[PDB]
Scaffold this motif. Sequence first.
Motif, PDB file in Angstrom:
ATOM      1  N   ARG A   1      -5.711  97.155 -31.524  1.00 22.32           N
ATOM      2  CA  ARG A   1      -5.731  95.972 -31.102  1.00 22.32           C
ATOM      3  C   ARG A   1      -7.147  96.239 -30.175  1.00 22.32           C
ATOM      4  NH1 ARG A   1      -1.354  93.202 -31.511  1.00 22.32           N
ATOM      5  NH2 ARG A   1      -1.632  92.481 -29.338  1.00 22.32           N
TER       6      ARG A   1
ATOM      7  N   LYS B   1      -5.647  85.680 -17.448  1.00 26.30           N
ATOM      8  CA  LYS B   1      -4.817  84.970 -18.294  1.00 26.30           C
ATOM      9  C   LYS B   1      -5.089  83.676 -17.133  1.00 26.30           C
ATOM     10  CE  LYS B   1      -1.102  88.471 -19.500  1.00 26.30           C
ATOM     11  NZ  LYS B   1       0.236  88.709 -19.385  1.00 26.30           N
TER      12      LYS B   1
ATOM     13  N   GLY C   1      -0.686  83.250 -25.409  1.00 25.36           N
ATOM     14  CA  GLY C   1      -1.719  83.790 -25.233  1.00 25.36           C
ATOM     15  C   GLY C   1      -3.226  83.461 -25.667  1.00 25.36           C
TER      16      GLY C   1
ATOM     17  N   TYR D   1      -7.128  83.747 -23.487  1.00 26.76           N
ATOM     18  CA  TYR D   1      -6.829  85.077 -22.193  1.00 26.76           C
ATOM     19  C   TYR D   1      -8.394  86.403 -23.052  1.00 26.76           C
ATOM     20  CZ  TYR D   1      -2.256  84.849 -22.082  1.00 26.76           C
ATOM     21  OH  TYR D   1      -0.719  84.964 -21.473  1.00 26.76           O
TER      22      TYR D   1
ATOM     23  N   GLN E   1      -4.844  90.278 -14.691  1.00 29.00           N
ATOM     24  CA  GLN E   1      -3.479  92.299 -15.171  1.00 29.00           C
ATOM     25  C   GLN E   1      -4.184  93.443 -15.725  1.00 29.00           C
ATOM     26  OE1 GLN E   1      -0.046  91.158 -18.257  1.00 29.00           O
ATOM     27  NE2 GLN E   1       0.904  90.998 -15.838  1.00 29.00           N
TER      28      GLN E   1
ATOM     29  N   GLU F   1      -0.507  88.685 -34.577  1.00 32.56           N
ATOM     30  CA  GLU F   1      -1.143  88.063 -34.039  1.00 32.56           C
ATOM     31  C   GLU F   1      -2.531  87.632 -34.337  1.00 32.56           C
ATOM     32  OE1 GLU F   1      -0.591  89.733 -30.606  1.00 32.56           O
ATOM     33  OE2 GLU F   1       1.212  88.289 -29.924  1.00 32.56           O
TER      34      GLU F   1
ATOM     35  N   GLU G   1       6.201  89.616 -19.797  1.00 31.43           N
ATOM     36  CA  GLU G   1       7.142  88.432 -19.089  1.00 31.43           C
ATOM     37  C   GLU G   1       8.516  88.412 -19.825  1.00 31.43           C
ATOM     38  OE1 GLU G   1       5.248  84.319 -20.770  1.00 31.43           O
ATOM     39  OE2 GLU G   1       6.004  85.144 -22.602  1.00 31.43           O
TER      40      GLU G   1
HETATM   41  N1  LIG Z   1      -0.850  93.568 -19.502  1.00 30.04           N
HETATM   42  C1  LIG Z   1      -1.066  93.243 -20.817  1.00 30.04           C
HETATM   43  N2  LIG Z   1      -2.035  94.125 -21.388  1.00 30.04           N
HETATM   44  C2  LIG Z   1      -1.703  94.558 -22.316  1.00 30.04           C
HETATM   45  N3  LIG Z   1      -1.996  92.953 -23.439  1.00 30.04           N
HETATM   46  C3  LIG Z   1      -1.479  92.225 -22.354  1.00 30.04           C
HETATM   47  C4  LIG Z   1      -0.697  91.968 -21.388  1.00 30.04           C
HETATM   48  N4  LIG Z   1      -0.347  90.919 -21.307  1.00 30.04           N
HETATM   49  C5  LIG Z   1      -0.225  90.251 -22.569  1.00 30.04           C
HETATM   50  N5  LIG Z   1      -1.071  91.037 -23.228  1.00 30.04           N
HETATM   51  C6  LIG Z   1      -1.182  90.741 -24.853  1.00 30.04           C
HETATM   52  O1  LIG Z   1      -1.413  89.243 -25.087  1.00 30.04           O
HETATM   53  C7  LIG Z   1       0.044  88.783 -26.011  1.00 30.04           C
HETATM   54  C8  LIG Z   1       0.097  87.474 -25.586  1.00 30.04           C
HETATM   55  O2  LIG Z   1       0.841  87.904 -24.532  1.00 30.04           O
HETATM   56  P1  LIG Z   1       1.913  86.864 -23.578  1.00 30.04           P
HETATM   57  O3  LIG Z   1       1.575  86.590 -22.474  1.00 30.04           O
HETATM   58  O4  LIG Z   1       2.964  88.239 -23.145  1.00 30.04           O
HETATM   59  O5  LIG Z   1       2.541  85.601 -24.504  1.00 30.04           O
HETATM   60  P2  LIG Z   1       2.744  84.867 -24.535  1.00 30.04           P
HETATM   61  O6  LIG Z   1       2.882  84.309 -22.829  1.00 30.04           O
HETATM   62  O7  LIG Z   1       1.573  83.380 -25.052  1.00 30.04           O
HETATM   63  O8  LIG Z   1       4.133  84.344 -25.373  1.00 30.04           O
HETATM   64  C9  LIG Z   1       0.592  89.638 -26.431  1.00 30.04           C
HETATM   65  O9  LIG Z   1       0.047  90.317 -27.415  1.00 30.04           O
HETATM   66  C10 LIG Z   1       0.545  90.897 -25.355  1.00 30.04           C
HETATM   67  O10 LIG Z   1       0.941  92.351 -26.256  1.00 30.04           O
END
Ligand SMILES: Nc1ncnc2c1ncn2[C@@H]1O[C@H](COP(=O)(O)OP(=O)(O)O)[C@@H](O)[C@H]1O
Lengths: 334, 334, 334
Positions: free
Chosen positions: A212, C132, C139, C142, C173, C204, C283
Amino acid sequence: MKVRIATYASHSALQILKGAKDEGFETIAFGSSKVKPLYTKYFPVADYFIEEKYPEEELLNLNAVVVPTGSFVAHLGIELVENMKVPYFGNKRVLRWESDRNLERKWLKKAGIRVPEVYEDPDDIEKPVIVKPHGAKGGKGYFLAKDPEDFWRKAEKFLGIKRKEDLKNIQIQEYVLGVPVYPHYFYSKVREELELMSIDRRYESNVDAIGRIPAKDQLEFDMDITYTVIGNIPIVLRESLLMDVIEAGERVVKAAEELMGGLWGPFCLEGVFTPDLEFVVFEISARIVAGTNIFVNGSPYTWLRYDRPVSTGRRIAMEIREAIENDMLEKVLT
Amino acid sequence: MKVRIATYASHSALQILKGAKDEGFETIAFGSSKVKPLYTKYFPVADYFIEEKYPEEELLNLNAVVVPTGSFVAHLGIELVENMKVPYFGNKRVLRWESDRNLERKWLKKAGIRVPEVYEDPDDIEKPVIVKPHGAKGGKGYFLAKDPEDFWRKAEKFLGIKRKEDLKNIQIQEYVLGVPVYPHYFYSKVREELELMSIDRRYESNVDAIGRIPAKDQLEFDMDITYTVIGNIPIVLRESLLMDVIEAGERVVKAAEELMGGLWGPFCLEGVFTPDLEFVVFEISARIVAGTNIFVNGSPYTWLRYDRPVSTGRRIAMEIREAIENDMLEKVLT
Amino acid sequence: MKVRIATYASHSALQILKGAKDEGFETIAFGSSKVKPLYTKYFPVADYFIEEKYPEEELLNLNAVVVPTGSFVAHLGIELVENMKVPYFGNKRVLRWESDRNLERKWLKKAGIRVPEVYEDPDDIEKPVIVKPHGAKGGKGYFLAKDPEDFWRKAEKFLGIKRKEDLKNIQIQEYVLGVPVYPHYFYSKVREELELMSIDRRYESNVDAIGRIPAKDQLEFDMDITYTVIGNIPIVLRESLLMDVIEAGERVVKAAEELMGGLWGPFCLEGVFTPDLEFVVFEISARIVAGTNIFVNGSPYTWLRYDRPVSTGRRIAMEIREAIENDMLEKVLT
Ligand SMILES: Nc1ncnc2c1ncn2[C@@H]1O[C@H](COP(=O)(O)OP(=O)(O)O)[C@@H](O)[C@H]1O
Ligand SMILES: Nc1ncnc2c1ncn2[C@@H]1O[C@H](COP(=O)(O)OP(=O)(O)O)[C@@H](O)[C@H]1O
Ligand SMILES: Nc1ncnc2c1ncn2[C@@H]1O[C@H](COP(=O)(O)OP(=O)(O)O)[C@@H](O)[C@H]1O
């Protein structure tokens, strides 16, 4: 039912005990007091929970038969497991073969199973390899190496091995470029028959997380590749591959009958499929594997031959019940 | 039942014949003697096994209707299948449209389906491309190219094409960066209704194996990327995407009615979903696909509209049965 | 049943309305006329379809209770949802806590949930990060930054950011290297009890597609990495990780009881599992998530404790029914 089904409270106890329940057994989980709510509150599958590593006396008092989970021998030790008085579902003699990488290889070779090439001498490395430290389970300590000289650099880095041997029973193995596949089998000693129960793809960290991250971005992670088991993903195979997968299982059982007094109950061949449709096996796991946990409500394979949901846990309970009913319980216990 | 259901002993025969059993049909598998135990012992779903490629005489004697599988047209050849005297479930006229990439493209374009850009002249290559050898099935011989001169190098290497044209009906296609998605459909001619049966993601080697190897370690392997089909992984889609996917299938069916006398029975649109949520399709597979093999016990989509497990195999048998019961069996056979 | 179950026609409406149907409720779908055929023709689960974003008066006349879906708050806006006269299954006070990433983190900290490091100053970046944008959903927007220099270059390109003074509420983050895992929970206010419903891995684009491209070939693509939600893949976890995941849910519910008047109904903790078995959460999604859609016919977890198929959608309807029968319907509605 006089016999109760008992399991160590980890790995696949939920499946095993739900399956026993479904077949009319009373169920016992034993292990850490920390995990007790899982088996008694969140998923009430254990009629008895004993907060002990191995409560021999109470288990004998409860007419327990132990169905071994995939970490039962790990948590208790192979010496304790082999001397246990509580009945053990399966063949205990199989335990020594799966704890020794050379015995694993001997078994696989006799069963005519495709295996990766191994190098005793690192100077003979002709293709990329994976290095497996002694006694390692769950792929800990595993690292990749491209040629004889890259190996020494990393052998000193990870294992401290100074150049020119003193290789502390490591295995150096050809890295086979194929997709991970894990067929789950069950050999019925009662019905004298081999079944394909299900197949999964094991979900591992960080190895299944690195793809990824774009190539350009990977460097600054200072990535060490790890194979920690996190979960399981259900799969089916291409149908024309099933016959050789099942035959591989038959030869594995036949070889075990001639080497260690037999193999019955759940097992799995952990391996990969290459672009030329070859199944190259890394190990025979002669036990119920975590992958079977998906199929509490049966699998695409069991639903081809059963009118009801059949997991490996239920199939184990089915076998024990049928052994009791056929007056041959001692035949499936050691 | 007078009619028996027959299928070639590969690809999706276990699902098809189990589905036929469930609807009250007697079953026939025909093919290699090597695979007979799969269909008669391990998964006994075939009441007859005939060890011949195409036993036309016996099939007619047994009142057989052939449900076509993935390997059937390839093993027997397109001409034999076209002239076969044994009834064929589905429209045989569709076969010439899917065996030709130019015809596939015309069909998809008419049905208003998003397709990748194609390149006749290699000098026009401006973004990364996938090269598809003529007639190639199962991803056989596919390779990637970045620009005109990189294309020419690899074309000589893999295909023996000397620089500057003589491109033996090769397809050069824009590589679409999206996630593989395979919706499985069934059009009922009896009901005059399109259904979404299930969706999967196909599991392929070595392509799905390379993401487990870090960028820094990849060059050591001298990787030629391959798309050999190994298995299938179940998926669902984001719900807001279903209407587009279902309307796509409707247009594909409508286009086939104006072009080739219709499309009924199972089919699959094979493609990817891009970040902008577009469904880009590489081909229509006008048959039962391997991904449907996951869903012997129904799918997240069939369980929304049926009270029982409905695989694509069972859905076919349902259609055949209802056709017989509505005196219109000849409408669904060519 | 007097009460009818209503839901916005998107995200998980098929599962929700089928679940309500199974529990003896009449069902209402509301949303776009474009999607009406999905809910009334292809999967006839909606007894009423209303072609309005939020038809308050009609919903009140139909004695409706709204089960909130994924895109419900997005489409209607947070204030309209907060001021709606139609009853809402769950606690509306939760909405502000999940719309604000600061309040999200305050909730996660109180619940003792492992979270990634956050950087206020981009000069302090010692490990790769994910960026973010403020209020970003799905997402979107990002991007990865590998060092302080890489951040400023990409922040300028994508957002027009030049110095610390104008970071415009972006969250920087720590990128946690681990496999994506999404446990689906249900807290029953009727039974005062937490359940684990199921677990998935979200699919995704294009992030899950890039690993199919060899490292050597990746630069020609000039990849913007995207996290657009396309679908869902069913998983199970390693059994010894379940208590970790379940206790995490318990602390989230407990912290919500002190912070916001409680959390009941469906919720999900979105995160990853690291090589050392840590569950790092990105989250709290305090609602039904699309990953639940796989499990229309129950899950490997619900089949451990139920005799029938139980989806999150059905579980919601079960809760509403039991609340009515226990004369405590007002307790589960805001
Ligand atoms: N701190 C992080 N480290 C690695 N991957 C992240 C992090 N934050 C989010 N992701 C990745 O980004 C994608 C969307 O994350 P998230 O913000 O939880 O989705 P949403 O808030 O849109 O439901 C996911 O595939 C997640 O694994
Ligand atoms: N020779 C090999 N080539 C490629 N991958 C391998 C090889 N041996 C093991 N692996 C991979 O390493 C991981 C752990 O394999 P294995 O050694 O069977 O685990 P363990 O013995 O610790 O249970 C798996 O993901 C497997 O695919
Ligand atoms: N234009 C394209 N862009 C990206 N991937 C492609 C493209 N065409 C085919 N593929 C990939 O190559 C593999 C083979 O697909 P396809 O050509 O449809 O099957 P077949 O080779 O059996 O006709 C699939 O995994 C597919 O995702």
